[PDB]
């Protein structure tokens, strides 16, 4: 026996010695040293100090620069708002709780923190899907005489909200559940214990298929088509050095985007798959925070890739931060 079970939790540490306590009631210094809880807090501090300015600045320059308020940019605004739900739903909470060594807000605060942090990351995830569907529709021109307007952009944002609610709300009404994960300082979906009263197994399947595989297929199809269309256009227009440059830039950005998506979600999907197929094995607290580390750092590196590496946003940000220079 490798863990300790409670009504609303699973502590990944055996109670053979009798030292295990409810992660809602007492510190968990028996599954990690205090200095590791301090390093957890230090990491949350890093993600706040970087993730908040980068994502807030994205909203701010959009308010100050008229040319940013285009429909194809709406979804990037959505990305920045979603990353802020991650910053204040999860990161700040986990900074606070880690300094106590346990989840001081109780089962209720566990559902709040789990709902808003999972909602933030799922809005961000489906924003990357919708961004690719749109780029594919606009560049590859799969439809006859279709012009992408403001109402399509709003439809795309609402679709991300609905898809993220379809992931974050069921654990509040009895399909899966929210419990403290890893070092017991942050709450997330229970994708690792076979809690049958909330039907965890079928929810993890539904998560794996609908919120990982389908986003993976759509992103790969849409950008595969986009790279193919751009390479086809450049091959048929080799007298244009700019078009050859565009082809190289699009291919480089597409590689960065799909690699960044894999770095963000493949560890969560891999660990969940391994736990699913090897049901009945020891999975420690710090090992469980590895896929959390990868997914949460995307609140910093997604806006670097999708905002700061975008010519228009970078120009306006530099202008805003340097008071008025180019």
């Amino acid at each position: 026996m490798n863990g300790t079970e409670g009504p609303n939790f699973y502590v990944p540490f055996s109670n053979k010695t009798g030292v295990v306590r409810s992660p809602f009631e007492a510190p968990q210094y028996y599954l990690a040293e205090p200095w590791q809880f301090s390093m957890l807090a230090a990491y949350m501090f890093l993600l706040i100090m970087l993730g908040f300015p980068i994502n807030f600045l994205t909203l701010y320059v959009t308010v100050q620069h008229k040319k940013l308020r285009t429909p194809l940019n709406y979804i990037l605004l959505n990305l920045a708002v979603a990353d802020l739900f991650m910053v204040f739903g999860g990161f700040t909470t986990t900074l606070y709780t880690s300094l106590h060594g346990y989840f001081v807000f109780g089962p209720t605060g566990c559902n709040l923190e789990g709902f808003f942090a999972t909602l933030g990351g799922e809005i961000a995830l489906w924003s990357l899907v919708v961004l690719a569907i749109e780029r594919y529709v606009v560049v590859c021109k799969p439809m006859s005489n279709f012009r992408f307007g403001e109402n399509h952009a709003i439809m795309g944002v609402a679709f991300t909200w609905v898809m993220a609610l379809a992931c974050a709300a069921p654990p509040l009404v009895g399909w899966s559940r929210y419990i403290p994960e890893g070092m017991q300082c942050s709450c997330g979906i229970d994708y690792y214990t076979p809690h049958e009263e909330t039907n965890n197994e079928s929810f993890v399947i539904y998560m794996f298929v609908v919120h990982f595989i389908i986003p993976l297929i759509v992103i790969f199809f849409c950008y595969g088509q986009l790279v193919f269309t751009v390479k086809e256009a450049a091959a048929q227009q080799q007298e244009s050095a700019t078009t050859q440059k565009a082809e190289k830039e699009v291919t480089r950005m597409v590689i960065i985007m799909v690699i960044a998506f894999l770095i963000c979600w493949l560890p969560y999907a891999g660990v969940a798959f391994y736990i699913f197929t090897h049901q009945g094995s020891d999975f420690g607290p710090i090992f469980m925070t590895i896929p959390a580390f990868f997914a949460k750092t995307s609140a910093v590196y997604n806006p670097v890739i999708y905002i700061m590496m975008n010519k228009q946003f970078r120009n306006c940000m530099v202008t805003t931060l340097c008071c008025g220079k180019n």
């Binding site: 780029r135 560049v139 269309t229 256009a233 078009t243 565009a246 975008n310």
Partner: peptide, 11 residues
Amino acid sequence: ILENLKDVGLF
């Protein structure tokens, strides 16, 4: 294709 690439933020 170039104008569409600029619109979507890829070039």
